[PDB]
Design a protein around this ligand. Structure first.
Ligand SMILES: [Mg+2]
Ligand SMILES: [Mg+2]
Ligand SMILES: [Mg+2]
Ligand SMILES: [Mg+2]
Ligand SMILES: [Mg+2]
Ligand SMILES: [Mg+2]
Ligand SMILES: [Mg+2]
Ligand SMILES: [Mg+2]
Ligand SMILES: [Mg+2]
Ligand SMILES: [Mg+2]
Ligand SMILES: [Mg+2]
Ligand SMILES: [Mg+2]
Ligand SMILES: [Mg+2]
Ligand SMILES: [Mg+2]
Ligand SMILES: [Mg+2]
Ligand SMILES: [Mg+2]
Ligand SMILES: [Mg+2]
Ligand SMILES: [Mg+2]
Ligand SMILES: [Mg+2]
Ligand SMILES: [Mg+2]
Ligand SMILES: [Mg+2]
Ligand SMILES: [Mg+2]
Ligand SMILES: [Mg+2]
Ligand SMILES: [Mg+2]
Ligand SMILES: [Mg+2]
Ligand SMILES: [Mg+2]
Ligand SMILES: [Mg+2]
Ligand SMILES: [Mg+2]
Ligand SMILES: [Mg+2]
Ligand SMILES: [Mg+2]
Ligand SMILES: [Mg+2]
Ligand SMILES: [Mg+2]
Ligand SMILES: [Mg+2]
Ligand SMILES: [Zn+2]
Lengths: 81, 155, 151, 144, 129, 87, 25
RNA sequence: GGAUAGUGGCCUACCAUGGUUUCAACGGGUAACGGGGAAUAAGGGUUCGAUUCCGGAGAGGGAGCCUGAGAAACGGCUACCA
RNA sequence: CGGUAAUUCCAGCUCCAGUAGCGUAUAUUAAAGUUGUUGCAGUUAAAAAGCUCGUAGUUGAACUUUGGGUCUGGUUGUCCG
RNA sequence: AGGACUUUUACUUUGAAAAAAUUAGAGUGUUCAAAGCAGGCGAAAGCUCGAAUAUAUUAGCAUGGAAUAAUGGAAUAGGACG
RNA sequence: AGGGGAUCGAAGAUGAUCAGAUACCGUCGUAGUCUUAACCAUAAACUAUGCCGACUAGGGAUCGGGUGGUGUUUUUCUUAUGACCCACUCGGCACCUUACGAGAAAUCAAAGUCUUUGGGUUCUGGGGGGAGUAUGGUCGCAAGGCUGAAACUUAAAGGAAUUG
């Protein structure tokens, strides 16, 4: 503790700490490419989305607002961006 | 705050001892006398071709500018033919090594050649005692507006 | 963690990513993003809702990253910036709502204090928007002006 | 960090704060109010003459049992009346009734000294001559 | 609110020195902090520090070696005339043989001895020894 | 410390903590001085030849004595990877 | 003595003095 | 415009309604003449400065004035009050 | 201190301090870090307004050329003439 | 040495200024000193060095510097140049 | 002032206890307690600790939110929730240990980073008593609130802790 690296702390400790508290502050969020069983369009959505995101082709919601991050619509298949 | 008539009061308003000959047929506007106060101060063209009289004009009147030159900010332009300038400064209390914001109100006499309004920073110059309290004649309106040069927003 | 008008000490916020430039995976066009912003504004949406719509339904991380200008700046360039800034307008709406609740029931003193707090915040924000000259120098806040601006 | 302001342009409030706090002292308040000139038996005076009215002794406090031999004197400069103390073994008899006596301070900043209650003034001279010269028989009372 | 950032930096340095550490993480990392730590490096009271760009005020990581004993800002940056430098050194530094009143002159942020060498003086920043 | 001619006038130029570089007080009755014996090729502790580390009483009281000794021994090639410079 | 009852005695003195002044005001 | 040696609400005539102020104006107190300075002394300061020098004011309190270049003089006059 | 053995009162002896000066009174300064800008304290010793908003006042995040190479002038300590 | 434009400060270095007496302080056997601005040296035949300096920390004037602290540019381009 | 009017209970009525007892114990008992308007602005209104900001030390829990678990029961066949379990984080009322820091100590994780004295800022105190009294304002219908001395007197008053 008396001698310790702050310029290069362990990446495990990086994921340990809070956002806004890293060496350089970086968001923990990410984007997703979701496909709805309806059509073949790939929709880009946010992990912590705040709106009932729907595909422009069909009036089917793909996410759902939540106190934290998005909860999907039980049938959409996603890939992390 | 300036009357449309070039003379409005009961007495006639003329520049003393400058005479325009009516028998002559040159028929120029008048014979207007003027001077430059020096110190590299530009006489305003509104005074150069103007039609006011202002006995106490540094540029057209008999008053001469000499002595102190003070820069201040206008705090009251809304009494006739005269201005009230707020001069701010810092008095140094040495027992604490600390400064103290202070202000003084300097009356002055702004010529009609200048268009002044509340908030304009003004360079003013010393002269003879003009009234009981005014001893300075406005010599330059440095900041005409300051932050009102651009007003509208039409892209 | 200041909470200007209360005793809160929270720091819940968002950390802007280090890289200012566009994300590698984004394929959209900046001109198309500007057109989308313009259309959303013409629908009658404030810049914050425009940003939230671009972040959720599309891959726009943030307008300044993609276009180079901010959302309100983009709207102003096209002349769609509202005459009252969005935060001040929302404060006006909240104040008029609490005043309505007050005039419909007098005995509630807590909402009276909250209205005092909201009015103080409105005064501070109005002063700021007045020294920057976004609002005219004669702009002020009294009763029945908030309703006129909101309605 | 501290109650007082520290900014470079905070001289005004520091000065007025010191000026308002100075009244908490007793010496400063006395000096500025001028209480000595108005209320004290002498106004800024180290000594003062007076006329003996009567010849009284006052008992001492609890731990000290005696009767200190004082004298009531009406001041001539303004007319106030104060008790004063004649300091020595056999000096009471030296001062007689209705003679001019020069009173001085009692040394305790205008407050009662020791065990003597309600007195604040010594006696230095009587009828023009000093007590100390009489007590050692160096001079004698003129008896006028 | 954070009024004097250099005060926070020097307080963090003092706290992380008294506890016996060898490093500090100063968050706001202005020009003045960089110049102050650079002077301390020049005079040896500090080790090998580091600026970490965040695109937002950056940060600084400071390496110590236990040689320092106290930093400290004179929070009101008093206008120090060239005659008053000696009085400040007497009132702040523990001995005439060492210590340095870091003050900001028009010729940059410099230790008091260097400023006296240039025969120039300005406002006072802090003191190190 | 130094006389103008150039002779020392100080007495007992004091030791310093080997982990925090702070001097050791004369009456610092918490500080210790560890000796670690040098080891030859066949594991025989060579007598009278060792390496000394002066740990201050402050770090011992705080609780960083063993960690500091771990780091200090790792630096001078005594223990293999017992201490990581990045926590 | 308690500060409470000294306060109350002062208040009763003010009682009497206020009634007297009101009579002679 | 008058008066001034001369600028100046200094005074008059007619207009305008203005000027100062929480950066303490105005009022009250000063057993206050201002200053150069004195005592005190780690540094910062606290108190004093009627008086040997420079300024100001006064000749019992008030007003008025002749003479002159210079006085509202008072070891110059006029009047009132004491 | 003085209540029948007074190292304190009145005296004699001896001694001490300053010394042609010393003692008193008031005022004032240092002592006073008991005015605290340097430099005071506020839990209980005196002292955090019952709490919040708020004009003036005081204070207020970071950022806008930092580096280098040469020549050259004084000043030093250089080695010695 | 002339037209021309001057972002403005706060800050700080240097200088001119801040009357003499006083404070500091150089020289000087008033018999020493407080002091004073004196005196010293010839062969005794007139020859002489002096009467030094600094500080005042505010206001004003000039000057070099550009860190620290503040204000102002170009957003309707009514922006800068040819 | 208008409404109510159960309980409990200033005043009062008594019955006891006592030397006295119009006090404590007891029984009744108006005003009040409960409310709609209008006043009042004081409390040991206390954490007797001003607010904002930074840093400094270890141990668990607890509340609100959010992340992850190849976790466990749940049952609606599986899953989605929910409820727990483990780990982390933000914010809050808090708590245990300790001095390596601070205090006159009791003690404080702030009452620390203060003679190695300066992050910004507001209010208050200069021995005790007189005294939060008088007077003068100002607010209040009234009660009283805010502001608020001196004369004089006194060598102490007071804080924490140690032994009796
Ligand atoms: Mg008796
Ligand atoms: Mg007088
Ligand atoms: Mg005088
Ligand atoms: Mg005086
Ligand atoms: Mg007098
Ligand atoms: Mg004189
Ligand atoms: Mg005269
Ligand atoms: Mg007389
Ligand atoms: Mg003559
Ligand atoms: Mg006369
Ligand atoms: Mg005479
Ligand atoms: Mg005369
Ligand atoms: Mg005569
Ligand atoms: Mg005897
Ligand atoms: Mg104290
Ligand atoms: Mg108590
Ligand atoms: Mg208390
Ligand atoms: Mg409080
Ligand atoms: Mg304000
Ligand atoms: Mg800044
Ligand atoms: Mg002089
Ligand atoms: Mg002398
Ligand atoms: Mg009723
Ligand atoms: Mg009863
Ligand atoms: Mg009974
Ligand atoms: Mg009962
Ligand atoms: Mg009952
Ligand atoms: Mg109270
Ligand atoms: Mg309280
Ligand atoms: Mg007291
Ligand atoms: Mg009391
Ligand atoms: Mg009253
Ligand atoms: Mg006790
Ligand atoms: Zn579809």
């Amino acid at each position: 503790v008396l001698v310790q690296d702050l310029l290069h702390p362990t990446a495990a400790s990086e994921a340990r700490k809070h956002k806004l508290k890293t060496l350089v502050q970086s968001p923990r969020s990410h984007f997703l490419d979701v496909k709805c069983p309806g059509c073949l369009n790939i929709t880009t959505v946010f992990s912590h989305a705040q709106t009932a995101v729907t595909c422009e082709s069909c009036s089917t919601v793909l996410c759902t607002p939540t106190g934290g991050k998005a909860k999907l619509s039980e049938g959409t298949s996603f890939r992390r961006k | 705050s300036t009357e449309l008539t070039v003379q409005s009061e009961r007495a006639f308003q003329k520049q003393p001892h400058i005479f325009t000959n009516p028998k002559a047929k040159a028929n120029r506007k008048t014979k207007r006398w003027y001077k430059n106060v020096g110190l590299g101060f530009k006489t305003p063209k509104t005074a150069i071709e103007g039609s006011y009289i202002d006995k106490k004009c540094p540029f057209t009147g008999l008053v001469s500018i000499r002595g102190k030159i003070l820069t201040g900010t206008v705090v009251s332009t809304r009494m006739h033919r005269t201005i009230v300038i707020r001069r701010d400064y810092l008095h140094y209390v040495p027992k604490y090594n600390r400064y103290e914001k202070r202000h003084k109100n300097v009356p002055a006499h702004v010529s009609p050649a200048f268009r002044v309004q509340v908030g304009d920073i003004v360079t003013v110059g010393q002269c003879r005692p003009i009234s009981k309290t005014v001893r300075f004649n406005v010599l330059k309106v440095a900041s005409a507006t300051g932050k009102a040069n651009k007003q509208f927003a039409k892209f | 963690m200041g909470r200007m008008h209360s005793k809160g000490k929270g720091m819940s916020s968002s950390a802007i990513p280090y890289s200012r430039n566009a994300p590698a995976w984004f394929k959209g066009s900046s001109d198309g993003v500007v057109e989308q912003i313009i259309k959303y504004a013409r629908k009658g949406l404030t810049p914050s809702q425009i940003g939230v719509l671009l972040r959720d339904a599309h891959g726009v991380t943030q307008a300044k990253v993609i276009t180079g200008n901010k959302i309100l700046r983009i709207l102003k360039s096209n002349g769609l910036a509202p005459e009252i800034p969005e935060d001040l307008y929302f404060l006006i709406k909240k104040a008029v709502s609490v005043r309505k609740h007050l005039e419909r029931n007098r005995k509630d003193k807590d909402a009276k204090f909250r209205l005092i707090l909201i009015e103080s915040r409105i005064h501070r924000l109005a002063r700021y928007y007045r020294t920057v000259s976004v609002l005219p120098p004669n702009w002020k806040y009294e009763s029945a002006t908030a309703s006129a601006l909101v309605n | 960090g501290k109650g007082k302001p520290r900014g470079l342009n905070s001289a005004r409030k520091l000065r007025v704060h010191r000026r308002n706090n100075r009244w908490a002292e007793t010496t400063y308040k006395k000096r500025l109010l001028g209480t000595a000139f108005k209320s004290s038996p002498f106004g800024g005076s180290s000594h003062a003459k007076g006329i003996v009215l009567e010849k009284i002794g006052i008992e001492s406090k609890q731990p000290n049992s005696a009767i200190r031999k004082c004298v009531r004197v009406q001041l001539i400069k303004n007319g106030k009346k104060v008790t004063a103390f004649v300091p020595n073994d056999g000096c009471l008899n030296f001062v007689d009734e209705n003679d001019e006596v020069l009173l001085a301070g009692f040394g305790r900043k205008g407050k009662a000294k020791g065990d003597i209650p309600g007195v604040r003034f010594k006696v230095v001279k009587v009828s023009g001559v000093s007590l100390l010269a009489l007590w050692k028989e160096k001079k004698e009372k003129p008896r006028s | 609110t954070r009024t004097s950032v250099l005060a926070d930096a020097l307080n963090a340095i003092n706290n992380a020195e008294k506890t016996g550490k060898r490093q500090v993480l100063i968050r706001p990392s202005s020009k003045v902090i960089i110049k102050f730590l650079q002077v301390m490096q020049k005079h040896g009271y500090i080790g090998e520090f580091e600026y970490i760009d965040d695109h937002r005020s950056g940060k600084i990581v400071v390496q110590l070696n236990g040689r320092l004993n106290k930093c400290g800002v004179i929070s009101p940056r008093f206008n120090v005339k060239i005659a008053d430098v000696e009085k400040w050194t007497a009132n702040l530094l523990p001995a005439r043989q060492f210590g340095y009143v870091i003050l900001t002159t028009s010729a940059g942020i410099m230790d008091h001895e260097e400023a006296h060498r240039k025969h120039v003086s300005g406002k006072i920043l802090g003191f190190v020894y | 410390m130094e006389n103008d001619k150039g002779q020392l006038v100080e007495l007992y130029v004091p030791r310093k903590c080997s982990a925090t570089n702070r001097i050791i007080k004369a009456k610092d009755h918490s500080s210790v001085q560890i000796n670690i014996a040098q080891v030859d090729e066949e594991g025989r502790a060579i007598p009278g030849e060792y390496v000394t580390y002066a740990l201050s009483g402050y770090i011992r009281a705080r609780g960083e004595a063993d960690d500091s000794l771990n780091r200090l021994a790792q630096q001078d090639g005594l223990l293999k990877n017992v201490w990581s410079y990045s926590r | 003595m308690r500060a409470k009852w000294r306060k109350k005695r002062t208040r009763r003195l003010k009682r009497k003095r206020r009634k007297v002044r009101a009579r002679s005001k």
